[model samples]
Target chain A: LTIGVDIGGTKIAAGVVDEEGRILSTFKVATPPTAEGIVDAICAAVAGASEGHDVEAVGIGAAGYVDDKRATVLFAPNIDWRHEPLKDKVEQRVGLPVVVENDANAAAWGEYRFGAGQGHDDVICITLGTGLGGGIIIGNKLRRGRFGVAAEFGHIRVVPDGLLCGCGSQGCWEQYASGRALVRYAKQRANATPENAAVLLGLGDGSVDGIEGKHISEAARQGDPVAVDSFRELARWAGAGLADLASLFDPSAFIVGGGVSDEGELVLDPIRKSFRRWLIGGEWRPHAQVLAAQLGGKAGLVGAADLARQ
Target chain B: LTIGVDIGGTKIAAGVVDEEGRILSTFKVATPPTAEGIVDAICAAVAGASEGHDVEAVGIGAAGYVDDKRATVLFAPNIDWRHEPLKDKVEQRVGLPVVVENDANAAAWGEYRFGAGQGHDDVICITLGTGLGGGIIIGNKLRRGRFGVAAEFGHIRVVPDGLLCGCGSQGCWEQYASGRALVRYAKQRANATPENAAVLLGLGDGSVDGIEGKHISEAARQGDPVAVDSFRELARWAGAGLADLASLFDPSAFIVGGGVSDEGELVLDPIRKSFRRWLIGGEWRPHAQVLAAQLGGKAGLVGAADLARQG
Candidate 1:
């Protein structure tokens, strides 16, 4: 057994994972404002999870630019990590071997080894949250390219000069397909629908700042046209990019995760329908399966722990 | 040493290949019109190329689908063959083991194993000839996908509902990037430029039938605006698709072959320049090298010969 820890911008989650990818114990804590305190919080959770079990090592799935050795979190866009020796700090504090990986990559590795992609060789995992994050595995191996920073699928431009992406590119597949993009679309429709406008405002509590994916998804479930439109827009881009990606690598399956994935058929059906329309030689090639992530938020934790065991 | 025979719709080309991928001798003959006659023509070329060198085996690269066993031509898009036992027939006549492969795939395998992609594990080879064709190699192995049909890069759509493609699809990458596409673009420009239409017409004899990719490339070198514009159009799509492909596999390099590659920098420079612009995450990732095929028209022949040598 091993202890896996995942540190995000706002929270830190850790758990003990068995060989079957089941969580035996779990811990969660709010991220401290300071980086030093954040490190301490992660170490405390790791130590707490290891108290009764024969934990052999620690695995960390962190969001940042990890070193080629996968030891330290070199830089994080969301967190203030600058060339920090993250793995070593935890390993010394806990007195155990530790391994580190990029959050999305680790989650994908975990899925391929234990979840939907267990039987497939080439697989791509897409996490559609505030930003679209992706991990690519080819020949059953994670493809990190030349640098440790590979599998940046979100930044690939699906529409030329369409919308500005966080990566500073226009029409990135992520900019159109992510959860936040859904919020923006829903807000536009809510402004246009006057009838549902008051109800949406009350659901999200009377502030545009309150408008978010969860609120929009709930609205969609209740037959809100504005919310449904947003999902359709999101599904269109996801389907187009998925079709193009299938054309490129011909992977056997694509595993999708993050907040928006909870909608299930509302998102997946449209995505599958659009993929066939955009795919080149769609009638001629073998189609790939698009599935939801089996592990919810704890996926990164389980993935990180699995890497340590390996 | 072994003999490799490439049977095309119009011709049969054979070469004697050594272990180092060098060709010592070559032979060619016009391909017979009938399917059975085509096989006969290939066997004759193999015999002639074998000479007194004691050929161990023969490899045939055809422009079609090879069976999973790699011993028969299941179908040839450019020829009249369906489930033809090409390998067994040739082997029976020549008394040697035989291997059959898709022409573009065989050429790419040759390039990957012995040419420009010798050191890389992931490669996509694009052949921009009368039609665009491609082959993909990953981890030193060729992929035919689930149905013995993969790496059909030419058929991949670049523009939705744009231009008519040979495979009945509109806006396929091949329709925009191939030599055939360039000639069509050049002819349209020639018709539009009435002032300099005579110079273009002289090359094409004022007829579309005479216009070809080589004619336009030569004219472009001699300062023909029509030819220049056509090349620019081809390069744009080439770069656009390469960028899209980069996002997918992040391949190490792309080897370009076929007749149009003879234009060299006139086409390649623009492709390189536009590829960067079209690539997603252009600033944060490693780039792939897009270079011309080193073997020219004989690549398929040499590639097929090398396959036989492996046997």
Candidate 2:
């Protein structure tokens, strides 16, 4: 048994997971702003979750870049974690072996072990949240590369001289295929054709700046024409990039997850169609299954525990 | 020791290679037109090449797609080979174990074992010939994926609705990065600025139609403005594609082979520069070394023999 911890902006979630991936028990705590305080909170959460369970080890799905050694982390957004030895710190406090991995990687492993990725040997999982994140699983093992950050799929240049990205590159896959990109499309579409966004305008404060992700989702299902077009635009780029992924990874399946996938078929079906259209030799070659992620937010926790067991 | 057979358009070359990737002896036979004749010629070449070498196994570096099983081949250009059981027939005639692989994959393997890819465990090789072809090697093993064709780099859509490909896809990487693409650039550049291509046109028959790959390489060396521009154009697309490959495969090295890489630094320098310009995290992440293939035209033959030994 192992305790897997997932730290979010609002709260920290720690769960004691068994070998079969079931959460035996869970503990929660409000997250602190500082990196040092967050580590204390995570330790406390794990201590609470392992109260009655026979926890042998602990694991963390951290929101940053884990090094090639998989011990230290480089938190870009959190400057205090320049070279934070996360595994060593956690192991010292918890008095157990600990494994640290990028949050997206852990989520993919969870899907592969217990969710949509079951029965598949090779899988690629993509998260379409504020920014795009994903993990590569080949030959049934997580491929962390020589550097521990192999599956940074969002930053690949999809269109030359297109949108500039935070990573100091141009034309990244995320600029057109994430939660923020979805809102960008909604605003652009609404501004150009306000008459079509009646339901969307009424759902919000009647301005393009009023367009937000939650409002867009609600307006999309309400049969708002402009809002639906925005989703279609998002799917077009998402699906095309997925096709490019097929060209390179050639995995047996791709599991789509994160905040953007909450609408399920609303986004997945169009992505599915777009993938087929862009796939090389799609007419004859076998296509990899593109399925929606099943384990919502708990995927990181479950997957982290499994990694510790391994 | 094992025998590797490479079938070309005009001839078949077979050689006996030892464990350290050295060739002790070689034999050649004129290639035959029909699939059945090609097998016969391969057997003859192997039989002759193994005259005094104590050969054990045989492998062929074939031209078309080898299936998931790696026994049958589907020759698209040659309609007769719908599902040619090349391995079964070769084994029956040679009375030895036989392994079949794609020609490009074999070349990359050769480099990985002995050539430019020597010390690297993971390598991705691209052959910028008339079209683009490559092979994937990771963890010191060839990655053929669920299907046998994992490294079809040419077929990937680099541009949206760009150019049509023989495989029926548009904007394939090859359409912008291969030998034909180089000639297309040269022609367009010469037509747009004929004054700059004076040296290039003089080397050819003094016409856009007369400009060829050989003329472009020579003209670029002579400092012909339009000709050098053509090579740069090719390097731009090729390097950008290599950068994308790095984003995914993240190999330790990339071996540039095929006809396009023969000019060495003339083309390699630009590709190297372009790769850095487009690398996702060039300022920090370790970059994969891009090196020119050293085996020249012999990579496929040497690599095929090595793969047979593994069997």
Candidate 3:
């Protein structure tokens, strides 16, 4: 058995995974602010998850840029992990060989090995979460780029000088296609045309600022036009970005996962339709399959453990 | 030695290339419209260039999507070469082994091997002619994708539902960053704001449709407001597209070429500035060098010959 830890902005999730990628036991804890405290929390979760199991190694998946050697967390968008020595410190605290990877890369590897991306030699895995994250697998191998800083797909500009992104750039793909985008769109629509968003505004207690992504999805299921249109807008941007990415890598399939994917065909159908519409040689060339992710929330931990074992 | 032929829409250029990519002899001919005529013209140019020289193989670089096997042309935007058996027809007529490659790919290989991108292992070569074309090199090897149709960088959509492009898509990078974009900007500005385009309209003889890309470049060089702003707009799009590309490939350098690149720093300086502004993690990581192409127009011939030598 191996231990995998997924470090998020708010929570630290750890699990004991078997050879078949089944999680035997899992542990969760709130993430700390400081780098040292975060490492301690990770080690605590790893220890708690591996209470009765003999773990061979520990793997960590964080929401940040990992170095090529997978020893350092180069930079994180929502954390203070600039050039942090993640693997070295985690190994010392956990007393096991440690492997550090980008959380999206870990999840992509999990999906590729045991989830939606199975049987595909080339895959592009996208996570439509609080922020958009992506990982690329070409020829059955993870493409980490030369310095381990590739696959920054969300930061790719989809609109010139459009929405201001958190990455300090204007019109990043994430600004229009992520969970945050969904919430932003719902809020904008509800505030702009309150009469038309009766259902969506009711979910947020008649306040546009209080609306969330889950509320939008729940309202959409109840036939809310504003929420449904918001999802459609997000799907349109997602497909447009996917088509742009296909022009470069030309992967065999795209596996989409994360919280937003739970809506199923509500999001996937629009993405598929828009991808075809924006594709460069849509009528001439063979298009890649767009599949929903199957691993749920445990993909990051499972993939991290497997990578550590490797 | 190998014979390399560069097939363009208006002209057919051929040359006998030595081991070090130097042209020993050259031949030029007008391009024909029919596929058969084009094949015959290619043969004539190759035969004329290799008159007394012993050529081992022949390579033809054309502006189209060559199949992965480098034998057939899948499609050409400017020409009518759909599923054309280019290698077989050329090899049969030239009496030598023939290799077919995308003109942009051939040019990229040429730069990577002997020009501005010589020392870089990872390079992105962009040709900004009437249309924008690009080729990617990773680990010193050409990346032709799974279907032999990757690196169509100009078609990457930078604007969602923006300007309509010739490729039946809206807001393609080429629609805003190519020589055609420059001319379009010049014409649009001359018509929209004729007062500010005194120099540009003077060069175009008071007709917005007559303003070409070269005239705009000359007017911009002479401090014309409309012409200078048009170039700035093109540079913004080019830099924006480059930043997006860098996020994916993280290449070591970007080689800029084609007719529009003749303005030198007037184009390169703004592109470099805007790229840094748009690049993700701009201040935190290593940046790719943006350089000018050194081989001019002969890069296609040299690289095609070299690729033929490989096959």
Candidate 4:
């Protein structure tokens, strides 16, 4: 067994996972604001989670650019973790071998190991959360790339001279495919065709500004055309991007996760339809499966622990 | 030693290559029209090339989708070779072990082994000929994907609803970055700005329709504004596409081949600039080297022969 720690801004969660990817015990702690305090919290959570479990090692999934050695954080946006030696600090504090991985990569491995990508040797995982984040698995191995920073799928330019991104780039794939993008799609349609978005507007505060991704999903299930069109728009860009990825990577499967994917077939059916219409040579090639992640939010914690066991 | 056979429309060329990446002998034969005749010609060229040199195996590089097993040609564009048992037929005729590979994939492997991609384990080779085609090498092995047609780089859509491609796709990378795209760029600019294209048009028939890719190249060397801008336009699309490839593959180097790359720095400088400008997170990550191919047209045969030796 190994302990996996998922470091989040609001909370730090740790779990004891077995070889079969079963979580035996879990513990959660309020994340500390300071970097040093965060490291301290991680150790405390791991120690707390392994009270009766025979854990062998520890793995951490952090939101940043981890180094090739899987020890230090080269860069970060959520926390102040510049060149922080996360592995060494955790190892010293917990007296166990530790591996640090990018949170998305860890989640991808989780899905590949115990979730939607279980049987597939080559799999790609895309998380449609606040912003698009994803990971790659080639030949059943996590492809961290030459500098441990491959699979930056979200930042890929999809539209020419499109929306501006937080990464200081324009036309990023995430700008049009994430939960935030879904809300943007909802509000744009609501603002344009108010008569069509009556049900959607009524679900919210009858104002475009009050529109959210959940409100759109709720309105769509109620047969709102505007909400449905917004989803189709997001699906068009999302599925088209997947087609480009197929031309490049050609993986056997793609695992869709995150907040946006929670709607299941409502979003997936359109994404799949779009992927087929845009896929070049769809008639000749074997189509890759677009599976919904089975593990939900537990994927990162479980996947990080599995990496430690390996 | 191994013999590499390059199958073409007009000629079938075979070369005896050593382990040191040197061509010891070569033989060429007129390509036959029929698929059976083409297979026979490949054997004839291989036999002629191996007369003086002791060769172990033969590798045939054909323009089509070679199966993952590297034995059969699943499809072909130049030849009527659907489901053709190329490796078996060649091996039986030549009395030697044989391997078949896609022409673009072979050239990429050849470059990775001995040309510009040397010393780089993970490399991507983009051939900007009349159309765009490329190959992927990851961890020193050619990645043919789950299917045999992974590195179909030209087919990737760069612009939505841009232009119709021969492969039945629109806005393909080759539509904007290939030799054909260069000619289109030259003519479009020449038609729009006739005064700027004086040198370009003089090289042709002094007409926008008469301008060709070579005329643009020569005219640009003579300071033709339209020709220079045309190359720049092609470079912009080429470089932007390279940026996308960088995001996907993250290779150590990219080898630029094909006829469009013949101008070297005149085209490469602009491509490199655009690659830097459009590259996502350019400041943080290590920039892969954009290189020119070294072996010219010999890459396909040499690379095919090397793969045969491995098989």
Candidate 5:
């Protein structure tokens, strides 16, 4: 057994995983603001999860840019981690060798090893949440590129000179296809055409600023025109981006995960429709199957544990 | 020593290539209209080029989709080649084993082995001409994808529902960034506002339809505003597409070639500037070196010759 720890902006999730990727035991803790405190929190979670089990090693999935060596977190936007020696610190506390990986990469590893990507060798797993995160697996192994930062799929420009992104770019895939984009679109619709956004505004307590992604998703589930249209628009962006990626990677399958994907067929159906429309040579070439992620949020923790074993 | 042949829409070029990718002898023939005639033309060129040399095998770089087996040309837009068993026909006629490859892939391999992309393990080579063609090399080997039809860069859509393309699609990278695009831009300028198109109008004989890409290039070299802006616009599209490729491939270098690249610095400088601006994490991460191609038109023949030796 091994302990896999997933460090996020809001919480730290850790679990002791068996050979079949089953969690023997799990523990969670609130994430601390400081990098040092975050590391400490991870150690505490690992200790709690591996109390009685003979855990072999420790694996950490961090939401940051990990170095090629997989021993340091070069940078992270949410947790204020900069060149942090996370692997060494966690190993010293846990009394076992540790492997650190990007959370999205870890999640992809999890799916490739045990979930939706089990039968597929070349796979791209997309996490559609507040922002877009991607992990690429080529020949059943993670492809981190030369700098361990290859699958920055969200930053690839889908629209030229379109919208501003937090990464200081314009028309990033995330700017149109992510959960944040959904909320932004919903709020914009509510503000721009107040009469048309009656149902959406009602869900947001009669205020555009109060609108959230979940509200839009909920309203769309209830067949609200504005919210449903927003989802359709986001799906178009998702499919277009996937078609662009298909032109390059030529993967066998794409596993969609994260909060936005939880809407199931509501978003997936449109993605399928647009992916076909935008796909180059769609009629001739073999199309990749777009499937929902099976492991959900625990994919990172499970994947980290499996990678440490390898 | 071996024979290499590059079969294009209008011409068939063949050469005897040494172990070091050097051409010892060469021959060219105008491409015949029929598929059987094209095969006969290739056999004749090989026979003429290797009259004295002990040519062991024949490699063909075809301007179309070659199958994964490298034995057939699945499709060719310029010629009516559909599922043509080219390798068998050529081998039977020339008395040697034949290997077939996409023209762009052959050119990219040529650059990687002996041209500007030398010493680079991972590379993306873009050929800018009447249309865009691309070839990708990863870890010193060509990436032909699951099927043999990979690196069709021109077909990738850049704009949704934009311009109608000959490929029955809209807003392909080629529509915005090719020799054809330059001609379109020049003709539009000449027709819409002829007063500002003094240099372009003079070159086009005061007719909008007569403006060619070469005219635009000549005018740009002599400092024509419309010509210079057309090149600039094409460069922007080139860089934008390269940036998109970089995000996916993360290659060490990008080699630019084809007829449009003949303009040299006028197009190259703008491509460099725009590539940097559009590249993701440009300021923080290592940037791919964008270099001009060194081998010119012979790259395809040389690369095809090299690939045939492996089989």
Candidate 6:
């Protein structure tokens, strides 16, 4: 058995995993402000999770670029880590051989070995959260590439001169297709429609800023016309984004995850329809499967533990 | 000794080459009308060149897509061959092992092995011929890909919703940067300005169809305003096309060929300048060498022979 820790902004979730990717015990703790405190929280979670099981090693999935050495977190956006030796720090506290990886790559490896991409050799798994993040598997190995930064699927440029992307590039595929983009479209629609004002206005607590993505999606689920129109546009963007990505990478499947994917058929049906229409050489080629994540939120932990086993 | 035949629309140049990159004897003949006639012409040229030396194998380089079997011409616009089993016909007449390859891929292989692209593992050679063509060398191997149809660089769409290209595509890289495109520009200039059209108009004999790309380039070398302006636009388009190609392939060098490349420094200087400014990640990455081809017209035969030698 091994311990896996997912270092998040607010909390750190740890679990004791076996060779079969099964979690025996789990524990969560408040994330600390400093890097040292975060390491302490991770160690505490591992210790708590290993109460009844024998833990061999520890693994961490951080939200940043993990250096090739697999010991340090080079640059994390959410956490205070810049060239910090995360693996060594955690290993020192927990007394185990520690490994660290980018959360997306970990999740992708998990999906490839045990989840949706279990049988496929080449897979591109996109974690559809607040923004798009993904991992690439090629020829039974994760393609780290020459610079050790090969598969930045979100960074693929969709438009030459389009919307502003967080990566400082113009019109990245994710800027228009991620869950945040979908919510933005939904909220914008509710404000534009006056007929659904009484219902939509009350849904937003009578304030524009109060209009959240979850509220718009919830209203749309209840058959709101404005929300329905917004979902249509969101679906088109999703399909278009997937098609553009397929043209460049040509992966076997696209595994979707995140908060919005929970809606199932509502978001996936339109995405499927649009992807087929927009895909190039649709009649002549075999396309990848666009599906949901099977590991749920625990995917990162299970994947990290599996990596430690390897 | 090996026989290398370069079949063109008007002429066929055959050479008896030794193991080293040298021609012991050479012969030339007018290209024939029918497929059988073309094969007979090739055999005659090979026989004349062989003289006293024992020719081992034959390699033919021609424009058009050669099937994966490397024995047939799938299609040739300049030549009359359409799905012709050129290798078998030539072999039957000459009694030698034969191989055939597309002209562009042959030239690219020649450059990569003995010319500009030597020592580079991943190189993209673009020939600015009457129309543009490309050949790719990846991992020290010519990427014929599946069915010998890879490296169609001319078909890459650079300018979306722009000019119409002959390959049934809009805004192809070759549409804006090729010898034919240069001729088009020069003809338009001669038609638009009668007074400043002395150099170009004289070369065209006052007819748009008669205008040549070489004359426009020669006029530009002599500092003519119309010719200079035409090459400038041509250089910009070439640079833009190179920039687009570099972003996708990221090769170490780009070998520019064809008659238009004879403009030398006049055309290359602007193209280099614009590619430096506009290439993707221009400030951060290493730039590919945009140089002229060294082998001239014989590049096809040399490359085809070299590629065949590998097998």
Best by DockQ: 4
DockQ of 4: 0.55
Q: What are the per-residue Cα lDDT tens digits for candidate 2 across B214-255?
A: 889889999999999999899899998898888776778899
Instruction: Report clash pairs, candidate 2.
Output: none
Ranking by TM-score: 4, 2, 3, 5, 1, 6
Residue-wise C-alpha lDDT for candidate 1, range B1-311, written one tens digit per residue? 78887786678888888888888878888988788888889888887777778777788888876755677666676677777888888889988888888788788777777777777877778888877777767666776543455576776655655778766667677888887788778877776774554556667667656776667878877877777888888888788877766655567888877788756888878888878777754433457888777777777877787766553
Best by lDDT: 4
lDDT of 6 by residue, A176-258 (tens): 67777776776676557657645555688876557676776677778777667777887776776666455444566778776
What TM-score, computed on C-alpha atoms, does each candidate reach?
0.83, 0.92, 0.90, 0.94, 0.89, 0.64
Candidate 3, residues B29-138, lDDT tens digits: the string is 89987877888999999888988888899888988888668888888877778788988988888788999998888988887888888777778999899889888787
Model 3 Cα lDDT, one tens digit per residue, A91-147: 887788998987888998999888998898768899899879888786677766666
Q: Single out the weakest 10-residue window by summed lDDT for candidate 2 chain B.
A: B74-83
lDDT values of the candidates? 0.76, 0.84, 0.84, 0.86, 0.83, 0.72
Instruction: Please provide the root mean square deviation of candidate 3 (C-alpha atoms, Å).
Output: 3.1
Summarize candidate 2's per-residue lDDT along A1-310 as a digit string, tens digits: 7888897888899999988899989999998978789889989999899897788888788877665667778554443576788888888888888888888888889988999998987788998998898888888888776667578888777777788887777888888899989999999989998999989988889888998899998998888998789989998999889888887777888999989898889889888888887787654457889998999889999998898876
Candidates 2 and 6 compared: the better one by DockQ is 2
Q: Evaluate model 2: give its TM-score.
A: 0.92
The digit string of per-residue lDDT tens for model 5 on B1-311 reads 88899887778889999889999989989889887899899998888898778889999998887766888787787777888999999888888988999898888888888888888777899988899987878768786655576788887778767889877788788899899998888777667777767787787677888788888888888888877777778888899888878776667889998888856887888898889877876544578899988888888999999888884
Candidate whose TM-score is highest:
4
User: Which candidate, 4 or 5, would have the higher lDDT against the true structure?
Assistant: 4
Please give the fraction of native interface contacts (Cα pairs under 8 Å between A and B) kept by each candidate. Answer: 0.13, 0.34, 0.54, 0.41, 0.27, 0.00
lDDT of 5 by residue, A15-44 (tens): 999998899899999999887798889888
**DockQ score for candidate 5:** 0.40
Q: Cα miss at B122, model 5 (Å)?
A: 2.4
